[PDB]
């Protein structure tokens, strides 16, 4: 229909609007000039020209992976305000009351984040530090116990989710049909909220039937990564904890420790 | 031995990490919520939401046994990918000459489509549809012939294999030792690929003995297994070679007619 379309070139224009990164950019930037990290020489280096200050303090500055750690703290941070300003442009999200609002997006966020990480992933490494950036999944898998096991899983996902094939008009949706979960915790309007995502959900079937006519099984393909993501974010939030037990440098912002606070 | 350990540890985790569905999850889904299709009705609606491409033709859509056939053969497609890529673990695999490297999945890889189709199955039906749809015994059998008759020699292994009681720690062994055989036709380097059949034997050997210290027999009753999947996989290929002679509406895909073709 043309209020289907309509509303799926909607979403894309707000998550082109939103995101400060996207796939089409990040796969320009990743064919090539951003700066390689794939070791602790170029790691510091990276830091003292990215973020100075956070290395600015001489022999009170952190170890190199609660310095990581911090840098991955302040991007979801980040996506976070740019995902509730997309979350806007969901058709009834708007006119959901307050707290179901922040209950949606409390449990969706980071199933979106990593979804969205895998658009600036490859095999090899991703792009960081809005495009200036590639620190190679090697030296990812080089940082001590338990920082590595962070970031391995990501790239396991990335993978798989990035044969699947999707451009930015598919990833757009799927964030929004994320958001739009009505089976999530202490929702106060389900009913509501099932007829919101029914409809998004709708505008990306016939999205995909259209975009991808090649696929038959990509709406059910993509319906299991959305599984597949709140058990990667389920998994994500055990390791943090256990970071924030044992790691006592490894500070979490108090932004997102509210989001995962009673979350898992 | 802690290499043998560490074997059986990687098998596992390549297969965890090449196969998008696998016994624990297939458990947990069927234990429950997946769209069940009993019956025309449910079968035409499914289709609408979960494949929607493949019924997008009005009255040129196909018959319904057809378009079953059609969804079958999809997965076997993805399955052979996977299966390509879960092969590269085995200990000798990659290091094989390439044409032997396609024999053995040539042979292989419907063995284990059945054994690994058993973790979805039970009594009543199959899981289906990347874990969204639950299709039903009885529903296949309702299928006019010759299709009923693909579906049911499926649930009869696959209710003796999982009264076995294995996990995805053996299966993905066992997978592994399928792809493995030996005495394969036309095979290049026999000596090679029976040493690396020996490992992967050994391996199974000692893990279902520590795994299921409560029968003494699993080990060859998997081996019993193994031919009774090459003959499932004899006759599925002579029902398939009368479906695509009688049945002009049941196009093969060409991936699949090479590894059928001098198959049986
Ligand atoms: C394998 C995936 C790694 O990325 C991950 C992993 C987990 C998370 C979630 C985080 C974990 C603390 C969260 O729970 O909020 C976020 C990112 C996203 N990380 C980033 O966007 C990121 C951004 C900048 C950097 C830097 C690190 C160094 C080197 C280089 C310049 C400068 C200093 C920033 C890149 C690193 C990661
Ligand atoms: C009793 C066993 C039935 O399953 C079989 C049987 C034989 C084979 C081998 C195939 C036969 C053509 C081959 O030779 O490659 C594969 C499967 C595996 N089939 C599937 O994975 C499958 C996937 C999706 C569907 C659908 C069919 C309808 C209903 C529902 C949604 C949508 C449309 C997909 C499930 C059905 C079967």
């Known amino acids: 229909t043309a209020d289907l379309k309509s509303l799926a070139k909607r979403i894309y224009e707000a998550y082109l609007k939103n995101f400060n990164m996207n796939k089409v950019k990040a796969r320009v930037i990743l064919s090539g000039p951003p700066f390689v990290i794939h070791d602790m020489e170029?790691?510091?280096?990276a830091e003292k020209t990215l973020v100075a200050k956070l290395v600015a303090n001489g022999i009170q500055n952190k170890e190199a992976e609660?310095?990581?750690?911090?840098c991955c703290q302040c991007t979801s941070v980040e996506t976070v305000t740019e995902l509730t300003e997309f979350a806007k442009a969901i058709p009834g999200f708007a006119n959901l009351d307050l707290n179901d609002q922040?209950?949606?997006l409390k449990y969706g966020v980071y199933e979106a984040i990593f979804a969205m990480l895998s658009s600036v992933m490859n095999?090899?490494?991703?792009?960081?530090?809005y495009g200036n950036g590639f620190i190679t999944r090697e030296f990812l898998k080089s940082l001590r116990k338990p920082f590595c096991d962070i970031m391995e899983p990501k790239f396991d996902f990335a993978m798989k989710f990035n044969a699947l094939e999707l451009d930015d008009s598919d990833i757009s949706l799927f964030v929004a049909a994320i958001i739009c979960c009505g089976d999530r915790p202490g929702l106060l309007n389900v009913g509501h909220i099932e007829k919101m995502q029914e409809g998004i959900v709708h505008v990306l079937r016939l999205h995909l039937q259209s975009n991808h006519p090649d696929d038959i099984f990509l709406f059910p393909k993509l319906l299991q990564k959305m599984a597949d993501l709140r058990?990667?974010?389920?998994?994500?939030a055990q390791l943090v904890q256990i970071i924030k037990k044992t790691e006592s440098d490894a500070a979490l912002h108090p932004l997102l420790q509210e989001i995962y606070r009673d979350m898992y």
């Open 42 to 45: 170029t790691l510091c280096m």
């Open 231 to 236: 058990q990667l974010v389920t998994e994500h």
């Open 66 to 70: 609660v310095r990581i750690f911090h």
């Open 123 to 129: 095999k090899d490494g991703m792009l960081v530090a």
């Open 102 to 104: 922040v209950t949606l």
